[PDB]
Amino acid sequence: REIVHIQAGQCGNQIGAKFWEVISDEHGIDPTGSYHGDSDLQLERINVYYNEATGNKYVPRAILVDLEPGTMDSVRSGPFGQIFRPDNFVFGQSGAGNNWAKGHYTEGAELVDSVLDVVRKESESCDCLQGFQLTHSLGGGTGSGMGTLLISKIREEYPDRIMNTFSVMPSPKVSDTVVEPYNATLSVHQLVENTDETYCIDNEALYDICFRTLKLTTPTYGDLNHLVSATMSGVTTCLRFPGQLNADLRKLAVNMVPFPRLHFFMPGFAPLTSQYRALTVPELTQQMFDSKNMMAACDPRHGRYLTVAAIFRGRMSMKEVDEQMLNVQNKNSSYFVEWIPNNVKTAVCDIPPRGLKMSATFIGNSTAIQELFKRISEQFTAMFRRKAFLHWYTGEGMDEMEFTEAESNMNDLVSEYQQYQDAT
Amino acid sequence: MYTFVVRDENSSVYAEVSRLLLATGQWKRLRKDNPRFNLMLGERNRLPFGRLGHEPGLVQLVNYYRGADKLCRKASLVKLIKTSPELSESCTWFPESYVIYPDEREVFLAAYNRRREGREGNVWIAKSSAGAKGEGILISSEASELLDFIDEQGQVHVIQKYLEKPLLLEPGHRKFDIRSWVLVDHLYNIYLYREGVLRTSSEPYNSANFQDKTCHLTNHCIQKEYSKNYGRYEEGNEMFFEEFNQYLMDALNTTLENSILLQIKHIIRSCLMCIEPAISTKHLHYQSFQLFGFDFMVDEELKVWLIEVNGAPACAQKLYAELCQGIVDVAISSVFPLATSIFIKLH
Amino acid sequence: MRECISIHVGQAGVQIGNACWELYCLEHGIQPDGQMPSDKTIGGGDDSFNTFFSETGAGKHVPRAVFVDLEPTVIDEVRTGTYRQLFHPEQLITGKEDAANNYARGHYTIGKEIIDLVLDRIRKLADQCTGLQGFLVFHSFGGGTGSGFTSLLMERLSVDYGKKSKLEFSIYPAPQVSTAVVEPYNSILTTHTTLEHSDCAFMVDNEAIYDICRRNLDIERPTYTNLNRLISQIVSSITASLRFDGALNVDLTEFQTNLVPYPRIHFPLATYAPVISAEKAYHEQLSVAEITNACFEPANQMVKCDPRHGKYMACCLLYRGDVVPKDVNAAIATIKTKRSIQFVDWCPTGFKVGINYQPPTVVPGGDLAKVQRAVCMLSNTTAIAEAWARLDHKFDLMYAKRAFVHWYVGEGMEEGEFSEAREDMAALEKDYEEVGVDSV
Amino acid sequence: MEVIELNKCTSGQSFEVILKPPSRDPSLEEIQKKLEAAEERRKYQEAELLKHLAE
Numbered sequence A: 001r002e003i004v005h006i007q008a009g010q011c012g013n014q015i016g017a018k019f020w021e022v023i024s025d026e027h028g029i030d031p032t033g034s035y036h037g038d039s040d041l042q043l044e045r046i047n048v049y050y051n052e053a054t055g056n057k058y059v060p061r062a063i064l065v066d067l068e069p070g071t072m073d074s075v076r077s078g079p080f081g082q083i084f085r086p087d088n089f090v091f092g093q094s095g096a097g098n099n100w101a102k103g104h105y106t107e108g109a110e111l112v113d114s115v116l117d118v119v120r121k122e123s124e125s126c127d128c129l130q131g132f133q134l135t136h137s138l139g140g141g142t143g144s145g146m147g148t149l150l151i152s153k154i155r156e157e158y159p160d161r162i163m164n165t166f167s168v169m170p171s172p173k174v175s176d177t178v179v180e181p182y183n184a185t186l187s188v189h190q191l192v193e194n195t196d197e198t199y200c201i202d203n204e205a206l207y208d209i210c211f212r213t214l215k216l217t218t219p220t221y222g223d224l225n226h227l228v229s230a231t232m233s234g235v236t237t238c239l240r241f242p243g244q245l246n247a248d249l250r251k252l253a254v255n256m257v258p259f260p261r262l263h264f265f266m267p268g269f270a271p272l273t274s275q276y277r278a279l280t281v282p283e284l285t286q287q288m289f290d291s292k293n294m295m296a297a298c299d300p301r302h303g304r305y306l307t308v309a310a311i312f313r314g315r316m317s318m319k320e321v322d323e324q325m326l327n328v329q330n331k332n333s334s335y336f337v338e339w340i341p342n343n344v345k346t347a348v349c350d351i352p353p354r355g356l357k358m359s360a361t362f363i364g365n366s367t368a369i370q371e372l373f374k375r376i377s378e379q380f381t382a383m384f385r386r387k388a389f390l391h392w393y394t395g396e397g398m399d400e401m402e403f404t405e406a407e408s409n410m411n412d413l414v415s416e417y418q419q420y421q422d423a424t
Numbered sequence B: 001m002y003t004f005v006v007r008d009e010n011s012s013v014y015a016e017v018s019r020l021l022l023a024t025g026q027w028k029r030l031r032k033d034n035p036r037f038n039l040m041l042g043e044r045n046r047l048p049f050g051r052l053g054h055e056p057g058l059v060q061l062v063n064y065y066r067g068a069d070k071l072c073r074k075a076s077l078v079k080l081i082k083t084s085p086e087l088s089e090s091c092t093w094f095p096e097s098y099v100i101y102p103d104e105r106e107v108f109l110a111a112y113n114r115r116r117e118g119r120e121g122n123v124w125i126a127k128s129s130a131g132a133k134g135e136g137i138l139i140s141s142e143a144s145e146l147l148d149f150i151d152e153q154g155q156v157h158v159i160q161k162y163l164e165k166p167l168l169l170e171p172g173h174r175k176f177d178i179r180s181w182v183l184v185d186h187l188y189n190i191y192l193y194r195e196g197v198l199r200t201s202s203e204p205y206n207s208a209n210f211q212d213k214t215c216h217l218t219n220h221c222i223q224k225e226y227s228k229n230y231g232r233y234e235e236g237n238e239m240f241f242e243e244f245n246q247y248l249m250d251a252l253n254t255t256l257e258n259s260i261l262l263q264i265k266h267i268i269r270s271c272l273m274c275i276e277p278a279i280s281t282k283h284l285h286y287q288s289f290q291l292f293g294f295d296f297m298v299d300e301e302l303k304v305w306l307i308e309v310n311g312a313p314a315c316a317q318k319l320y321a322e323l324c325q326g327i328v329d330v331a332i333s334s335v336f337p338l339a340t341s342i343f344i345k346l347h
Numbered sequence C: 001m002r003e004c005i006s007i008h009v010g011q012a013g014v015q016i017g018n019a020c021w022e023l024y025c026l027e028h029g030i031q032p033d034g035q036m037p038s039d040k041t042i043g044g045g046d047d048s049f050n051t052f053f054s055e056t057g058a059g060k061h062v063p064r065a066v067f068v069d070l071e072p073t074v075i076d077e078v079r080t081g082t083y084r085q086l087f088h089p090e091q092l093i094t095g096k097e098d099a100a101n102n103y104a105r106g107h108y109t110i111g112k113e114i115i116d117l118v119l120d121r122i123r124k125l126a127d128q129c130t131g132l133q134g135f136l137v138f139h140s141f142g143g144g145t146g147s148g149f150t151s152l153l154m155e156r157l158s159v160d161y162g163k164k165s166k167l168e169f170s171i172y173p174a175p176q177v178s179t180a181v182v183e184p185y186n187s188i189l190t191t192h193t194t195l196e197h198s199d200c201a202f203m204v205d206n207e208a209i210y211d212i213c214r215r216n217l218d219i220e221r222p223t224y225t226n227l228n229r230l231i232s233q234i235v236s237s238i239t240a241s242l243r244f245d246g247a248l249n250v251d252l253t254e255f256q257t258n259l260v261p262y263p264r265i266h267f268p269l270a271t272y273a274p275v276i277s278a279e280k281a282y283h284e285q286l287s288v289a290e291i292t293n294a295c296f297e298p299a300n301q302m303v304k305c306d307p308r309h310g311k312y313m314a315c316c317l318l319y320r321g322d323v324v325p326k327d328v329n330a331a332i333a334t335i336k337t338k339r340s341i342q343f344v345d346w347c348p349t350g351f352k353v354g355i356n357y358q359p360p361t362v363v364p365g366g367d368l369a370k371v372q373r374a375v376c377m378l379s380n381t382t383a384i385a386e387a388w389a390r391l392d393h394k395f396d397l398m399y400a401k402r403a404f405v406h407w408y409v410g411e412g413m414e415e416g417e418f419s420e421a422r423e424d425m426a427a428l429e430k431d432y433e434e435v436g437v438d439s440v
Numbered sequence D: 001m002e003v004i005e006l007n008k009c010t011s012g013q014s015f016e017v018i019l020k021p022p023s024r025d026p027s028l029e030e031i032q033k034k035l036e037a038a039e040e041r042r043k044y045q046e047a048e049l050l051k052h053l054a055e
């Protein structure tokens, strides 16, 4: 049931590296790849994410990609940097200059075949590959442009495999350059066509959580990534540990995605605390459905849940979990569509994450996600209306028409979500 | 909070029940087809009982007993009485009745010939459930006109001995019928509402001419349209128990309780105990309650006869508030509690 | 003696199969290594237990069973479990990756690739039968494999074994027990395709088993193990007559003869009593009259519905333990004067009774207390159509928006198969209505 | 209320009680066509995808 992980560009590698640190600690893997855990439950599904090496070492099935070396030297110098297969660092020198065209059509195209060579090698040593997970941002050049180029080439070579992404959406509140909405709009169109499930991680939400809830006056990217890595661990619990749910990425897509293009999920996590206090099951369930715990800055009260997955971790009363989960729905039943019966699925795993007696992870397929794409669409149009900053893209050979098409594609996506928000 | 759905928009009674539920602040009305309800106020026909009681974590309650239609259709009521040993063909409070298809066509003529040969009163009435809304009724003394009438309508009818000697209110020499409201809750407690209504005729009772049918049929719609004197004795041709009891004292030196109400309670109890094993929701995966309208006639000997049982009754205007409040107290809040009794419990 | 082959498809079929064969071994005195010290005919024989077990030269008693699943992890538990020695490797068949809760993926995409292998392995078992009577098929409605591959296999079994009877044990989906959103689709698709090919099918609603484990076993959150050991008691009491000396339901043909006079209406309701907690320190043993009375309580039924508001076409009572006919008739007399039991007009009002003197066997350490007498009632009542209505409603809600339909079309299924299957169900519900209800 | 067809063995007994009296399949080839037709639709859809990716 193997998964091949790919991390691309600055954001993609920094969040990817944290993910591997977090789940290596959950499975008992030290930074040299030696297992030193205490429960065989840690090892039962270790092969989903790790290859076993010669000396009984475990190696992440992870490919690290960038068009400049800097961030990947940092990963190699990082805490768990020696755990990765050295042959799986694939990088150029030019950079992508926060430019989707450089990543997708010029600099990235020179590097992409080398990446596929490594992807092919990891897939070859898979007993039966489930599919792929990609971590990247949409606002830069490498993760956004080369990342979506990568997804297109993986689909051509593995058309029957699941493609899953963790995609960081840009926000003016946590912004590097003014062209982020261009890069994000070009990428969303690729994701609509070529992924099966995409976790929408909004840097605006991450910032608000660090500021408003965690009481960090000056959030850094590292603070933002703590939330991402905790969420990534949460949503992959059922892939990584045994439980009564006997389900993989395809079963997730089948039950979460009622229409192929509407596969953009709002993740959330509880608790988020600025701590030794016990969380009760009622509190854990209330917070996990609270907008303030969501990682896409969208108000779920502004739309309707098509489908929800909830994953509880820790030793707690399953009976109380069901009661609260039924309570949450029976109370707010105007936010669930009534034409998908039993559209809220609850799963449980006994192992809690590092440092918590219990936690809960939320995955929502809500029509409110349309607010995210509207926001990007508005920022796109405010510049594109004056053709501002376009020379950076036309100098890589792109035409204005390709921008007009990506803009229409995202507006169509928004209209598709709105069509089901009033569906009765 | 508690949740409910409304699936009968024409119900005067549960419109008011739902109005009261929302005003408690502790009930929320969901859409017609939301399955996550505690309370269903169901449709009259094809109520989907088979979809109740399968929602994890919801105690579900519906305002109809599945199977109570046996008591609440004219044809099946006759069948239920004749074939149930608890009620039996030797049942003294239900008129001689037969079901006729356009089957008991033969036995009805057998008793008809017996009475007419004995020169006894031989007036019968033919009616049906499909004959709703004040029409499709024939009172005759000749069996020919009764059977010829049913074949033309083309639906399952009942022929019943017409009570030729009714109790007649004075002044006016006038006919009436008694409506009693009965609530059966989820524990199958049988509650009789204290307040009944007499639905009166405005015209003097004429035993010679059964063709007019204004002084013979006491329905509020036939008196509102076809009757002179409508309203002169009582507002809306409705006499309530206090006045009627006072009348029975002044006129006949007895009380409503002794002369009539013991029989009414006896009949209600007999009918509902008879069908209890068929419709009880004790030990079922969902619970039922239901409001019933029992219609009674009183003869000149102060003998009470059951005429029919209504499964979706309305209420008299001045009694809507009290009874609807009683429904919430006894049938709904007893299952879904919020944060003197108007009913007589028939044991 | 005439052999029966059991076929277990998908996770639910396999895990229930394990609970059944474990219980069969305890009932017949077969140890996990397959030896049976009481079988004095070494290497052969045509005893009643040989309907379900073959015999090797070394005295090993081998289930006439095939286990099929499209991923390996559930059957791998069988291969390393307590009863691993019971089965040959040829009998345990696993694919590489499962059907992803998708009927179309189990039926068309993966099923096309594994069906000939499965039929080959069944043929190997058939070739050891002197007089094979047919097949018992265990599967869920809800799984991609349980729904999609089962219907493909049933079609091919009709081709390859045309004169052989086929019985189903089918797990009907419930949200309290790990259901997927698309299970109503899979349930309707597999019922439509399997209907013509199954002679008698026993539906078990996971909701009813769940609640029996909560109420009567005092298990707050039942697992599949709790669920399946209760199910295997009901299955055991249904198949006991094929495996023990007796004169009722002695071959598969007799199941349809006794329970199914109308071929499309072939879904008998099972009701079982008593279910008593083994942790109950103090228990009063229940009489014939009390366990028989309990057969008419919805709370003891394998599918929750109300038989008072349907009609019976047939009714069989299967007792295990200390029961004599005189108690049964005295108990039936009492119940007929208390309960609403109405048969259709063109059927006799009565009961076929079977008694086996051996009380139920209970799995050591299990949840079920040992009792001195138990009964399973199999009744063909139109009330079971309430379960079809519930499922068709849920189908209709999603299908009106075509939610999830693309997953099935993407496996090569035509959209028209959805409405074709829904149309079949509509005719089925109409058939129950014509049989079971009088005009209002 | 009558008992009929009483059979007795050392393992148990069986009998009947009557309270009241009363008053085509697809061939192997056809299955093969269906499975191949679905596979062709799968191949057709995959060829459209790869055509789209070639553009």
Ligand SMILES: Nc1nc2c(ncn2[C@@H]2O[C@H](COP(=O)(O)OP(=O)(O)OP(=O)(O)O)[C@@H](O)[C@H]2O)c(=O)[nH]1
Pocket: C009, C010, C011, C012, C013, C015, C016, C070, C098, C099, C100, C101, C102, C106, C140, C141, C142, C143, C144, C145, C146, C147, C171, C172, C173, C174, C177, C178, C179, C180, C183, C206, C224, C227, C228, C231
């Ligand atoms: N009673 C019972 N139900 C089960 C069991 N396992 C699964 N189920 C039910 O079966 C349905 C899920 O289908 P599965 O049988 O697990 O699926 P499958 O046939 O393996 O198909 P795929 O895994 O989709 O290829 C759900 O309704 C489960 O609740 C079991 O051991 N016992």
Ligand SMILES: Nc1ncnc2c1ncn2[C@@H]1O[C@H](COP(=O)(O)OP(=O)(O)CP(=O)(O)O)[C@@H](O)[C@H]1O
Pocket: B095, B125, B127, B133, B134, B160, B161, B162, B163, B164, B176, B177, B216, B217, B218, B219, B293, B295, B297, B307, B308, B310
């Ligand atoms: N057997 C009988 N003998 C004498 N009068 C009778 C009778 N049956 C009915 N009536 C009179 O005819 C009227 C109408 O009869 P019936 O009860 O069938 O009408 P209905 O079904 O409309 C009552 P409801 O409006 O409460 O449903 C009764 O109110 C009564 O006055």
Ligand SMILES: Nc1nc2c(ncn2[C@@H]2O[C@H](COP(=O)(O)OP(=O)(O)O)[C@@H](O)[C@H]2O)c(=O)[nH]1
Pocket: A008, A009, A010, A011, A012, A014, A015, A096, A097, A098, A099, A137, A138, A139, A140, A141, A142, A143, A144, A168, A169, A170, A171, A174, A175, A176, A180, A203, A206, A221, A222, A224, A225
């Ligand atoms: N959450 C998060 N966002 C980041 C991080 N690094 C960059 N970003 C965001 O990612 C976008 C820039 O893309 P980046 O990954 O740096 O460019 P790339 O290297 O060309 O892919 C902007 O929206 C940044 O706010 C990070 O470590 N965490």
Ligand SMILES: COc1ccc(-c2ccc(OC)c(=O)cc2)c(OC)c1OC
Pocket: A235, A238, A239, A245, A247, A248, A249, A251, A252, A253, A255, A256, A307, A308, A309, A310, A311, A342, A343, A344, A345, A346, A347, A363, C179, C180, C181, C182
């Ligand atoms: C690999 O992990 C999972 C695979 C499948 C599911 C899942 C989700 C949602 C469902 O209904 C909306 C469902 O029916 C089944 C499984 C799921 O949600 C519990 C998973 O964990 C997030």
Ligand SMILES: [Ca+2]
Pocket: A110
């Ligand atoms: Ca170059």
Ligand SMILES: [Ca+2]
Pocket: C039, C040, C041, C042, C043, C044, C045, C046, C055
């Ligand atoms: Ca032998």
Ligand SMILES: [Ca+2]
Pocket: C158, C162, C164, C196, C197
């Ligand atoms: Ca056949």
Ligand SMILES: [Mg+2]
Pocket: A010, A011, A140, A176
């Ligand atoms: Mg950067």
Ligand SMILES: [Mg+2]
Pocket: B308, B310
């Ligand atoms: Mg009426």
Ligand SMILES: [Mg+2]
Pocket: A246, C010, C011, C071, C098, C099, C143, C145
């Ligand atoms: Mg499976």
